[PDB]
Structures are given as C-alpha cells and as structure tokens.
Amino acid sequence: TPWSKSELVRQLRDLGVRSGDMVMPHVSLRAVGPLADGPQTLVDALIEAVGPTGNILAFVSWRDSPYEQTLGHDAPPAAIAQSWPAFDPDHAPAYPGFGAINEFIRTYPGCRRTAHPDASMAAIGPDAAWLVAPHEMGAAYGPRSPIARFLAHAGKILSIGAGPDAVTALHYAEAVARIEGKRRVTYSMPLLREGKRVWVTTSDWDSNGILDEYAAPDGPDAVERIARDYLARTRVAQGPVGGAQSRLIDAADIVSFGIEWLEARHAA
Template sequence: MDSKITPIDRAALVRDLTNLGIVQGDLVMVHASLKAVGPVIGGPAQVVEALLEAIGPAGTLLAFVSWDRSPYEETLNGRTLSPREREDWPAFDPTRAGTYPGFGMLNAFIASHPNAYRSAHPDASMASIGRLAPMLVTEHELGQAYGPGSPLERFVAAAGCVLLLGAPLDAVTVLHYAEAVARIPGKRRVRYEMPILDAGGRKVWVPVDDFDSNGILDCYAVPGQSDAVERIARDYLGEKRHRTGRIGNADSYLLSAPDLVRYGIDWLERRHPSV
C-alpha cells in the first residue's frame, strides 16, 4: 500500500456516490476495481456498505460474480475432463460457492453479504442485495446466461444503472444482453458442461449451449483486440450520455442500462445488418 495515499472512510464514499448521481431507491449493477478506489477504512466490506447506504433500503445492488471453480474452459466445445476429474469436481452451490477473482474482489464481499441472493447459473452467476434482489436472480437457467430470461433482461427492464467504479470498459456485462438480442447474422455459440445439484442433492453434469460472451462475432474474438463490449462502451462514453466522477481515488462512470443496451443493439445492427 502506498503510504502517501490517505485511506477514505465509508461516509466519504457515500458522498462520492451521491455526487455521481446515485439516489435512494436506485438499482445499481456495480463493476469495481478496489485497487483503483484505494485504501478504505474497514476494508472492502465498507465499500459494499457505502453502496447500500447510497441506494437506501428501497434500492438494489447487483453484481456479476461467476464462480471460481467454473469448468467452462475445461469442457468448452468438446474438451473433456477425465472420469476422475469429473468425479472430484465440486457441484455448484450458490449458497457457498466462491466468486471468480478476475471480475474484481469486491464481488466476493457482495456475494457473501448476509442479505445477498445468488443466481443458480454457475458460470454466469449474479449476486444481488436489496428490494429487487429475489426478482432479479432467483430465475437463471442454464442456456440463458445473459440473454432473454436472464437477470440482465430483468435488470434492464427495471431501469437499472451501471456503475463503473474504476473498472475497465470491457467489464460492462449488461452489453452481453445487447449482443444476445441484437438481430445480427453469424453469432458465435459455445457448448460446455456445468456440474450442478439436482432436486435430490446429487451432482449432475449438464450440457449447455449459449451465445459466446467472449466474442459474439468472429471479428470480436481476435486475441489481443477489443471485443464488442469494450468497443460499444467506449463509443457510448464518447456520446457523453453518462455521468462521471471520482469514487475514492477511482475515475468512475454512471450509465443508464436501458439507454446503453439500446445504443449497443443499434451499434451492432448498423455494423452487421441482416441480409
């Protein structure tokens, strides 16, 4: 930790969030870099509490948390695990599963909050706290990771907003919903398997077929190049339809999810029209 950086407290975070435009009753999907925010008195848990205080008891917090033991890569498009590996791999249990650290360590504190609800899709798991949390995440079937029927669809329908709290532009998960519903040809799909618990509490491996969130078209799946999510988000910010500010030490953005999704759908359909 840089000794020259003065730790901030929860009250300061709440003021920063309010100045950015978050109000009581808001539905907020957060993507955060704790490193960018800087040291916080009381640790990352106080960032979660500041977010909850800013939105109030009528508000709702949502985060994309995934799963640290997701076998997505190991079973992707025909890859296989050995019988022993399949036997030893844990089944996804939303009440105790870890979160994927690559999407930010704040997610672990959101998912483990005593009032959090967590969706049952292992790889695309969402965690939510607040008034709308049960509605948002209770239904999340395999094969509906980010598209119709997903928590993201309900988040957009409920006029949520996206908070980038020092996070990069490729982190805007709600744009995967725009990719899923945009009418463009040649969408990439992936097949993989997930271990879940059946009604009797036994582990079963379930095959999944869904849109490819790592590149909806071939041109957005080139290693080392920006995917569609990052390009759309960058162009959207260029339109100045968002609010900017600093949360702690992090440059932050507040975006309307419905407006961003409409923009993303139009962005994709104009560049890749159906024949």
C-alpha cells in the same frame, strides 16, 4: 488517509446515486485507494447509498467454473466429470478476475445468488429474489436472465475505475442483436439437483467474442468497442469515488445503443 464510509457515500450521491436505485457496480479496488476497513467499507457505502428500498446486482460467477475444461465437448471429460465439485450457491466463491469486491457482496447477509454456475449473479435488496430467479442454463445474459430484469427495472451501471471491457450488461445486446454469423459455444456445468451432483450440457452465445472479428485474443471484443463509442458520444455523469474516476450509466440506454451499433455494422 484511507477513505471512510461517510466520504464514499457523499461522492456516490454527488455522482447521482439516489435512494431506491437499482445499481450494478464494476469496481477496480486498486484505483479506489485504501479504505477505512478494507473492501467492506465500499460495500457498506453502496448499500447506504441505494437505501432500504434500493437494490444491488453483481456479476460474481464462480472461482472454479469448469468452462475452459468442458468447452466444445459434448460431455465433460472423464477426469473432470469424476472429481469436479458441484456448484453450491451458498458456499461457492466468486471469480476473482471480475473484482475482489464480489466476494464481499456475495457473503453479505441476505444476499441471494443465481443458479447459473458460470454466469452467477448476486443481489441484495427487497427485489433480490425476483432479480436472481430464474437463471437457467442456455440463458446466461439474454432474455429471461437477471440482466433482462435489471434493464426493465431502470438499472444503472456504476463503473468505479473499471475499463470499458467490464460492462457485463452489453452481453444482452449481443444475445438479441439481429446479425449474421453469431458464435455459439457448448459447455457443461455440475449442478446440485435435490442433493445430488448432475452434469448439464448446454449451448449459449459466446461471451468471449460474438463474431470472429471480436473474438481475437489480440484485439478488443464487441463489449469494449461499443462502450468506447458510447462514452465518446454521450453525456454521462462522471466523478471520483475514493481515488477512482467513476461513471454512472443508464443501462437501458447503453444496451439500446449496442443493439443498434451491432445491427448497423452487420447484415441480418
């Protein structure tokens, strides 16, 4: 028997989602189980749970981000520059690796989408426009980004069967932590500026390992190691949503914990 919108809303309220909350979900649909009407069921359940004053913020990115193709170059390679589509926020699909639910959030009526092609965020609710803008190249997850405003606005992270590596908000801790040797990357994105395609080159913190020891492809990154420590040490509301084991995390709390975790382990 597939889960119905009404059942998921009950489970979400028991977990601690309240009317008016600001919530950022990380979802594994395989762990939730079958849904009355597919993934849209869970989207409808989330929106009903935060109510007409609440807000949802999602990390959706872009299916065709040319990050790896432009990484480390001072300009896009000519093959890429000539034919790559410009990022069109109204039509560019979400990145499927971060979850199949994100394409449903993105196309929900009234959803606003941030301008950063690789770090694109989508938001639904009365405060959506204030959350999604500005989102400039060179400020993907740090101060001035949608993540910073989420943290200041009492955001909650809702992890529905997702692992500890999935907590995007911890990239804010990497950005602001006073530690030595932080990795940076250079890359290029094709934006749409008043109708025409423009390539912008920028640098930003490496989001695949903020220090060399976290950037190995074999081992865990800093996000995973912080989240695991936090969950072993902290009382966090835990409970099912659908068939998936879920958690509701205070975003400002886990991010503060991560800044201190990084700074305790590395000199300034």
